[PDB]
Curated annotation (Swiss-Prot):
Immunophilin protein with PPIase and co-chaperone activities. Component of unligated steroid receptors heterocomplexes through interaction with heat-shock protein 90 (HSP90). Plays a role in the intracellular trafficking of heterooligomeric forms of steroid hormone receptors maintaining the complex into the cytoplasm when unliganded. Acts as a regulator of Akt/AKT1 activity by promoting the interaction between Akt/AKT1 and PHLPP1, thereby enhancing dephosphorylation and subsequent activation of Akt/AKT1. It comes from the Eukaryota. The modification N6-acetyllysine is found at residue 16. The chain holds residues 16 to 140 of 457 of the full protein. Changing residue 16 to Q: Mimics acetylation; impaired interaction with AKT1 and PHLPP1. Induction: By androgen. Residues 30-118 form the PPIase FKBP-type domain. It is found in: Cytoplasm; Nucleus. It comes from Homo sapiens (Human). Part of a heteromultimeric cytoplasmic complex with HSP90AA1, HSPA1A/HSPA1B and steroid receptors. Upon ligand binding dissociates from the complex and FKBP4 takes its place. Interacts with functionally mature heterooligomeric progesterone receptor complexes along with HSP90 and TEBP. Interacts with NR3C1. Interacts with Akt/AKT1 and PHLPP1; enhancing dephosphorylation and subsequent activation of Akt/AKT1. Interacts with IFI44L; this interaction modulates the kinase activity of IKBKB and IKBKE. Interacts with IKBKB and IKBKE. This is Peptidyl-prolyl cis-trans isomerase FKBP5.
């Protein structure tokens, strides 16, 4: 499956290099630039628990998911992961709970200690 590939071939983009966020590029984006902290970012995404029938696709080619990068508007894994993406890039992330919802989780949506899988398209990014 897609998680499997990321495990085996994903690059660990954490700082602590603890394999807490593994990334694969599925489609290469355009030019070289990627977003700075405080850039407003526009993405499509979908996600699932790795071992779970929770799935999320609210922003799956419907409306863009927008947030401001590294302001903590999202889980650490996204502040980390999306920061690395070019405009037009699509990527898979596999995410240990420590870079997501941790032992607390986010009941009932996310259980305690969840690993998450996301497929993210970076549509665009703008200076705050
Ligand atoms: C900095 O730490 C956090 C920041 C934000 C939160 C809330 C969860 C936070 O969720 C996320 O960080 C991740 C990555 C971005 C996509 C949404 N995320 C999710 O995990 C997904 C999510 C989770 C949701 O509830 C947890 C959620 O509820 C509204 C949601 O709505 C669309 C989507 C998932 C649900 C089930 C999965 Cl399985 S994955 C969040 C949810 C919705 C929007 C959002 O930002 C944009 C906006 O508000 O419009 C931020 C928890 C945080 O810590 C746990």
């Amino acid at each position: 499956g897609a998680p499997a590939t990321v495990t085996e071939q994903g690059e660990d983009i954490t700082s602590k290099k603890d394999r807490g966020v593994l990334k694969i590029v599925k489609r290469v984006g355009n030019g070289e630039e990627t977003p700075m902290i405080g850039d407003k970012v526009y993405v499509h995404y979908k996600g699932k628990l790795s071992n779970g029938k929770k799935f999320d696709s609210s922003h799956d080619r419907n409306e863009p998911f927008v947030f401001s990068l590294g302001k903590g508007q999202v889980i650490k894994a996204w502040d980390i992961g999306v920061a690395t993406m070019k405009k037009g890039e699509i990527a898979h992330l596999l995410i240990k709970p420590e870079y997501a919802y941790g032992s607390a989780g986010s009941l009932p949506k996310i259980p305690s200690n969840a690993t998450l899988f996301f497929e993210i398209e970076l549509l665009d990014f703008k200076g705050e």
